[PDB]
């Protein structure tokens, strides 16, 4: 039986730009997660009505970008699902775990990339991004940006800016 429990119950979750992948050997399907879909804010499947569990944190307003065919900073530069995705996307609000007073800066997202990610590609590099015409030479300025940014989650944020834990099951 598939060890999905370890995936959902993990104490720590990755930043989306450094999204975590867990390979799960061929297993007896454990449907209890589906029957407990009420535990989650969203539970959607694609290509269903080789198992990977990918997981990470994003903000509430980005949950809709975790789906095939989406656009935006997350789908384009952080975590991209293919058009022929077969699997499920599950997410829940984690404000209780992942915000802190004065801001939790540990979760990051990539702002900029010279081209979009391919589906299931990851990029964790931190080269200073050249937004204008002069080379950056590793130095920040108004044309030269560190390519990641912190969410800064605070418990008092509105729900669209609260942290969400996401699990993507590909099978």
């Amino acid at each position: 039986l598939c060890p999905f429990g370890e995936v959902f119950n993990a104490t720590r979750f990755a930043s989306v730009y450094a999204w975590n992948r867990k390979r799960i050997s061929n297993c007896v399907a454990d449907y209890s997660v589906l029957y407990n879909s009420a535990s989650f804010s969203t539970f959607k499947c694609y290509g269903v009505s080789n198992v990977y569990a990918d997981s990470f944190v994003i903000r509430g307003d980005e949950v809709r970008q975790i789906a095939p065919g989406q656009t935006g900073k997350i789908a384009d530069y952080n975590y991209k699902l293919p058009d022929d995705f077969t699997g499920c996307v599950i997410a829940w609000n984690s404000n209780n775990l992942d915000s802190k007073v004065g801001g939790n800066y540990n979760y990051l997202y990539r702002l900029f990339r010279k081209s979009n990610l391919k589906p299931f590609e990851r990029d964790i590099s931190t080269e200073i991004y050249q937004a204008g015409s002069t080379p950056c030479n590793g130095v920040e300025g108004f044309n030269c940006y560190f390519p990641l940014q912190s969410y800064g989650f605070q418990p008092t944020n509105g729900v669209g800016y609260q942290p969400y834990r996401v699990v993507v099951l590909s099978f």
Partner: nanobody, 122 residues
Framework: QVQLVESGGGLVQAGGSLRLSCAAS????????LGWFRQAPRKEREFVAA???????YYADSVKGRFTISRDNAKNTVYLQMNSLKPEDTAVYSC?????????????????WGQGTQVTVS
């Protein structure tokens, strides 16, 4: 395009009870999550209660113990039973539907919206 129409709003006295209903068109009702939200003057929209395909439910803390959400798939209808009403419950209540097996409590994760019905608690 799924049409949602709320019924049941009105004037009630504090401590009274009132049942809202929302009729949905569309063939996928039984798999959808259905939610209720409310908007009071000068206040921002707030989640009230929601039910998913498997009849699991979730309530805002402010209404737990007093309100009950339920669904009748044969009638494409969701209901909000509101007991022990306080004047702080006065609001326009709206129903929403989501093509989602989860239990969304966030307005941005719903897909279709009704028109609202007024509930006023004196």
């Amino acid at each position: 395009q799924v049409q949602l129409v709320e019924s049941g709003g009105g004037l009630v006295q504090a401590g009274g009870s009132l049942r809202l209903s929302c009729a949905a068109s569309g063939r996928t009702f039984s798999n959808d999550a259905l939610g209720w939200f409310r908007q009071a003057p000068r206040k921002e929209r707030e989640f009230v209660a929601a039910i998913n395909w498997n009849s699991g439910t979730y309530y805002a803390d402010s209404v737990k113990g007093r309100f009950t959400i339920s669904r009748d798939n044969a009638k494409n209808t969701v209901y909000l039973q509101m007991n022990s009403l306080k004047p702080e419950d006065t609001a326009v209540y709206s129903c929403a539907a989501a093509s989602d097996y989860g239990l969304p409590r966030e307005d941005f994760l719903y897909d279709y919206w009704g028109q609202g019905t007024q509930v006023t608690v004196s």
